Amino acid sequence: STNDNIKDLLDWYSSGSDTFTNSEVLDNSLGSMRIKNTDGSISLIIFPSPYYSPAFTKGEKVDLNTKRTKKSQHTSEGTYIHFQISGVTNTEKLPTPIELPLKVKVHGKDSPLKYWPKFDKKQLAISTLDFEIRHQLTQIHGLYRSSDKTGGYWKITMNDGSTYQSDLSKKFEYNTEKPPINIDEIKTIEAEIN
């Protein structure tokens, strides 16, 4: 038996993410952006943090690696709208896709990775890194599925000593999210479950 909060975390992190490339900015406002994707759909994305406030202008191209907050809608004027949160970066790519240095320990013992993808983008928002990491944990390591795997943390260490960390017993803190980072500058990523 797990507590209801753990039940919310399982539903959020076990579902997938939304990925769109080379979308165009239609509008940028305080806390939100209207974006037009290549397949013709529109994305309304919210940005709750004062530290991560996208400054792209109308007409610029961006990539989306985000999560939806509710079901998409078909509008009277024939449009299809997605409701999402965070995850907008520039379109810079890496010379070659890299695999990120993730090590996982479940209750002290090392747990091997399975189907951990490579990344070809130069920048990724910290919330995207958060769900990729936690998705690997729920799907391959049993996080949130049983009463014994309901806590821990992940920690990212950069080549310069800067670190980012997140508490597994709580949903990601979007309201305090810092700006996207260059993934090629990540030294290590550690995750522990308790």
Curated annotation (Swiss-Prot):
Cellular component terms (Gene Ontology): extracellular region
Major subcellular site: secreted
Alphabetical keyword list: Secreted, Signal, Superantigen, Toxin, Virulence
Domain of life of the source: Bacteria
GO molecular function list: toxin activity
Subcellular location: Secreted
Family: Belongs to the staphylococcal/streptococcal toxin family.
Record's function text: Responsible for the symptoms of toxic shock syndrome.
The protein's name in its UniProt record: Toxic shock syndrome toxin-1
Positions spanned in the full protein: 41 to 234 of 234
